[PDB]
Amino acid sequence: ENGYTYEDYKNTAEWLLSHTKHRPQVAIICGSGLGGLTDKLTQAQIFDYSEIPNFPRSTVPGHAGRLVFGFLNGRACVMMQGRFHMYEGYPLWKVTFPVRVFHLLGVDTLVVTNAAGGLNPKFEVGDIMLIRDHINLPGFSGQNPLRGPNDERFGDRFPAMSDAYDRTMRQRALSTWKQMGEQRELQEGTYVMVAGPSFETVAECRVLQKLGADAVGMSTVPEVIVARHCGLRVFGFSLITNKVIMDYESLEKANHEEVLAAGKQAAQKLEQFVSILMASIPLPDKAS
Amino acid sequence: ENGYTYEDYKNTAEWLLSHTKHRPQVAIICGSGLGGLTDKLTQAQIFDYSEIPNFPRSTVPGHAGRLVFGFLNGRACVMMQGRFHMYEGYPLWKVTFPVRVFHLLGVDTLVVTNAAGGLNPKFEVGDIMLIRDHINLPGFSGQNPLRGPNDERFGDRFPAMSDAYDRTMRQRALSTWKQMGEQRELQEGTYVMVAGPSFETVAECRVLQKLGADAVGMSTVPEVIVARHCGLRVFGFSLITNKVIMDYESLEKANHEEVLAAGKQAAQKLEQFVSILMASIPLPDKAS
Amino acid sequence: ENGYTYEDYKNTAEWLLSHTKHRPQVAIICGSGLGGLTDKLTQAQIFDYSEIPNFPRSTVPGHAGRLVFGFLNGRACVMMQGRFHMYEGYPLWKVTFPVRVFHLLGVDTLVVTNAAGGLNPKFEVGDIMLIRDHINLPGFSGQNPLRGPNDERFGDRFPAMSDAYDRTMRQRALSTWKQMGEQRELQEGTYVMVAGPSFETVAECRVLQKLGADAVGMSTVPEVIVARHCGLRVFGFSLITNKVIMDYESLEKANHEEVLAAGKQAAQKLEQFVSILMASIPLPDKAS
Numbered sequence: 004e005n006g007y008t009y010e011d012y013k014n015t016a017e018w019l020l021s022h023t024k025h026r027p028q029v030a031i032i033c034g035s036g037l038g039g040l041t042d043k044l045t046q047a048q049i050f051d052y053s054e055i056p057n058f059p060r061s062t063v064p065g066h067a068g069r070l071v072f073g074f075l076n077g078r079a080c081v082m083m084q085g086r087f088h089m090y091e092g093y094p095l096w097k098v099t100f101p102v103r104v105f106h107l108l109g110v111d112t113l114v115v116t117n118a119a120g121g122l123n124p125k126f127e128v129g130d131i132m133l134i135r136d137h138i139n140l141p142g143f144s145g146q147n148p149l150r151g152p153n154d155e156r157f158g159d160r161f162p163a164m165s166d167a168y169d170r171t172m173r174q175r176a177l178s179t180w181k182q183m184g185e186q187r188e189l190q191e192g193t194y195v196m197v198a199g200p201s202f203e204t205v206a207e208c209r210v211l212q213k214l215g216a217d218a219v220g221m222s223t224v225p226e227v228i229v230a231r232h233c234g235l236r237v238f239g240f241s242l243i244t245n246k247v248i249m250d251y252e253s254l255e256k257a258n259h260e261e262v263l264a265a266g267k268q269a270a271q272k273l274e275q276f277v278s279i280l281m282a283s284i285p286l287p288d289k290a291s
Numbered sequence: 292e293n294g295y296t297y298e299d300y301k302n303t304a305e306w307l308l309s310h311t312k313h314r315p316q317v318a319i320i321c322g323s324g325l326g327g328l329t330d331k332l333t334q335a336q337i338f339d340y341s342e343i344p345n346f347p348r349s350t351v352p353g354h355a356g357r358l359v360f361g362f363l364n365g366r367a368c369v370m371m372q373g374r375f376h377m378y379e380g381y382p383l384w385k386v387t388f389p390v391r392v393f394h395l396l397g398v399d400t401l402v403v404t405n406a407a408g409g410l411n412p413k414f415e416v417g418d419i420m421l422i423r424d425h426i427n428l429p430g431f432s433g434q435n436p437l438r439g440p441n442d443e444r445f446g447d448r449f450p451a452m453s454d455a456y457d458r459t460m461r462q463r464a465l466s467t468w469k470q471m472g473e474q475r476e477l478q479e480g481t482y483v484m485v486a487g488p489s490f491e492t493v494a495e496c497r498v499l500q501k502l503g504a505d506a507v508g509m510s511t512v513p514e515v516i517v518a519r520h521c522g523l524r525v526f527g528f529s530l531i532t533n534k535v536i537m538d539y540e541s542l543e544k545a546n547h548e549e550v551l552a553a554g555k556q557a558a559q560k561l562e563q564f565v566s567i568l569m570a571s572i573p574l575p576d577k578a579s
Numbered sequence: 580e581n582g583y584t585y586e587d588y589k590n591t592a593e594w595l596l597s598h599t600k601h602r603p604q605v606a607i608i609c610g611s612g613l614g615g616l617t618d619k620l621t622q623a624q625i626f627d628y629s630e631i632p633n634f635p636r637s638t639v640p641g642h643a644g645r646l647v648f649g650f651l652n653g654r655a656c657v658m659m660q661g662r663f664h665m666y667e668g669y670p671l672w673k674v675t676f677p678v679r680v681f682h683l684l685g686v687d688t689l690v691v692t693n694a695a696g697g698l699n700p701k702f703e704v705g706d707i708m709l710i711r712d713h714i715n716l717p718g719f720s721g722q723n724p725l726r727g728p729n730d731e732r733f734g735d736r737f738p739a740m741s742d743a744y745d746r747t748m749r750q751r752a753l754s755t756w757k758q759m760g761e762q763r764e765l766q767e768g769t770y771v772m773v774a775g776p777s778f779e780t781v782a783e784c785r786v787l788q789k790l791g792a793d794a795v796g797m798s799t800v801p802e803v804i805v806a807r808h809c810g811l812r813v814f815g816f817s818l819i820t821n822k823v824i825m826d827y828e829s830l831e832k833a834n835h836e837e838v839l840a841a842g843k844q845a846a847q848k849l850e851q852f853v854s855i856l857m858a859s860i861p862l863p864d865k866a867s
């Protein structure tokens with residue numbers, strides 16, 4: 004919200020339009036190591052955040068920071084490769100700028116991916132967790148992308164998140180996972196946002212499991228919130244890249260350097276899976 | 292604390308004095324839909340935050356933002372209709388400016404009202420929860436109105452909140468509720484502050500119940516903290532305006548638009564109840 | 580991290596070097612009432628934060644704010660008497676400036692002390708809790724000293740804290756406590772950071788015990804995080820100065836004014852104990 008003015012979004016959206024023949028309907032934010040989805044697009048038109056009017060440029064990850072309008076599995080997409088994270092200093096109203104821009108672009112759906120740790124034991128590093136809900140930890144303390152005066156033009160002052168992650172798409176996906184006979188069922192769970200670079204400590208790991216979080220991460224939640232605030236049908240997954248050490252028997256890891264899950268075909272499984280799901284995303288056409 | 296200087300408070304308080312024949316003893320902050328209490332005052336003298344020297348002006352709610360010095364049930368009041376919330380961008384040292392101003396006005400008691408969600412099942416939308424305690428969620432993370440250098444003139448560096456909500460007034464109220472034979476006993480509980488516009492998700496609803504919160508809201512706590520820091524006898528209620536969905540059987544709501552609880556006579560029950568309680572508030576006179 | 584530039588640290592470290600004949604290996608941050616350790620140093624050379632190039636000066640506690648390079652029990656130290664706390668308005672990247680400076684000074688170990696409340700019943704006011712882990716509460720919400728672009732020169736973007744408090748030194752201390760026959764075993768536990776001046780309320784006391792915190796405080800965690808980010812072997816204790824009231828049978832206290840624990844010989848027991856432990860701290864020499 005804060006920082007930009009509606010015309011900032013207007014301006015950026017419009018410029019994007021007057022610069023891409025494409026008019027997307029689906030906005031996809033690729034987590035770490037899931038940027039590969041950008042390869043699944045046709046008629047791809049790449050834009051470096053850099054060259055886009057108000058778009059936050061990136062920090063070190065910048066050397067992996069672009070917005071690509073393509074076409075994914077029978078849907079006008081606009082993938083964002085390399086999202087913005089709070090721990091990079093981006094105030095949340097910047098992290099989520101793009102989600103507000105997309106809405107203005109005409110995007111009606113936002114599929115949000117992300118690599119995350121595993122709090123739930125049943126998760127196996129590599130798994131893919133359908134996000135059914137979220138525990139916005141930094142929001143409790145004020146770190147919410149909607150802080151500041153509300154832009155009625157975008158949405159309500161007190162949006163409900165109880166329904167964030169689309170029930171329809173979550174069912175029309177637990178099923179689709181079945182469809183291609185993916186062996187092990189698409190895990191489903193609650194993702195807990197946690198900001199700050201550092202990785203949880205076993206003590207923190209436990210207050211996260213107790214709170215009910217199935218997976219932990221440092222993003223998504225802010226983009227879901229404003230996507231919701233906008234209307235944007237929202238659904239997304241979480242590629243468990245490493246299991247968090249819930250007890251003092253350490254010497255066992257969960258390194259991001261050890262993102263190799265996302266540095267494997269795990270990321271590839273979630274990518275194809277997201278492409279197929281383009282078919283499950285409702286069209287703005289309808290047609291009975 | 293921060294942002295203003297002691298003379299900012301001095302100045303504003305004094306101006307208020309040199310502008311109102313009244314010298315209040317009780318400061319009341321009306322929650323959403325409880326501003327009606329302003330109607331229960333006699334010799335009311337209204338001041339738009341706007342016209343008061345350092346008082347934060349409001350955002351959209353501004354079109355419901357004034358401080359009215361009246362007289363409530365045998366007590367010199369100063370009601371604040373439409374409080375400041377963190378999610379409106381007000382840094383906490385602005386949200387709570389008024390509480391510090393009141394103290395300088397001579398106010399010795401602060402009754403804080405607020406509309407909130409219902410985490411405790413025994414609560415019925417419409418209920419009125421006496422605040423016995425609070426879980427300051429944004430304070431854990433730094434969002435405390437006392438951050439910054441401490442003004443010894445106002446209080447201690449490390450105030451205790453263990454005793455925030457006055458035991459005396461809480462008992463001299465559970466009783467008073469009995470007095471007028473109000474049918475169902477005045478519920479009592481722990482209010483949990485949660486900032487950010489958004490409404491909790493079922494996942495968040497559950498970490499709130501587990502933490503021990505009886506009701507959830509986006510205010511009060513900051514004003515209680517500095518009121519305490521000042522001395523200010525503090526007691527207040529929480530008008531359960533909607534029950535929070537603790538489980539995935541949604542399609543059931545808790546809309547603020549659906550503030551109709553506070554958009555009913557519920558707000559009226561708490562208002563009269565607060566007026567009567569003016570009698571239970573100790574006087575600075577004493578007189579055996 | 581943020582606020583300063585690497586050359587700010589470079590500059591301050593170097594100035595410190597070109598101003599102290601000493602080259603420390605161990606950096607000690609004294610909690611409240613544990614500054615006394617400064618008396619256990621030989622060839623002590625005191626520096627007021629004030630006179631050091633980029634070092635945050637202090638607020639009221641300033642009248643107890645210096646960095647003393649001495650020699651503690653056969654180790655080149657650099658004690659910091661009176662640490663910086665978030666609740667004083669210091670952004671975390673200032674609270675922890677010194678830890679980053681020390682590393683540049685050549686310091687390889689950081690022993691962090693702190694006075695804290697007692698959530699665990701088995702703790703007796705006066706006890707000394709070896710910090711085995713921590714629950715960084717303000718970090719979940721964004722208040723992490725590493726927010727902002729990461730300085731690869733100092734460390735990784737996603738440091739692990741699972742191993743923060745050195746296992747070696749924690750065992751080579753539970754033992755050392757035995758060594759001098761200290762009667763009651765060196766308590767060990769999880770410290771929970773909580774910012775904001777205020778002291779927890781019974782409601783907050785309980786969400787702290789439930790989260791798994793053995794003791795509560797308003798510091799250490801930020802300095803541990805960046806110490807870790809740097810490499811810095813980290814271990815530290817927590818002098819339980821008062822038991823937190825976990826239930827509504829109050830009129831029982833935990834005043835910081837009632838820091839007399841730390842205002843006793845309790846602080847003295849932890850101080851000597853820290854001096855002896857200088858012997859357990861590995862040398863950069865090695866020598867079989």
Ligand SMILES: Nc1nc2c(ncn2COCCO)c(=O)[nH]1
Nearest residue numbers: 118119120219220244245257259
């Ligand atoms: N907090 C957290 N995030 C993780 C973890 N594993 C992956 N992520 C996602 O952010 C870092 C990329 O690996 C983990 O163990 N903890």
Ligand SMILES: Nc1nc2c(ncn2COCCO)c(=O)[nH]1
Nearest residue numbers: 406407408507508532533545547
């Ligand atoms: N967080 C939260 N606040 C509420 C709820 N209901 C009322 N409030 C008070 O703030 C919004 C006004 O209705 C609710 O369900 N959740």
Ligand SMILES: Nc1nc2c(ncn2COCCO)c(=O)[nH]1
Nearest residue numbers: 694695696795796820821833835
């Ligand atoms: N939060 C908290 N910190 C404490 C307590 N006792 C000591 N400390 C450490 O910070 C204040 C110094 O006493 C306590 O009860 N609560």
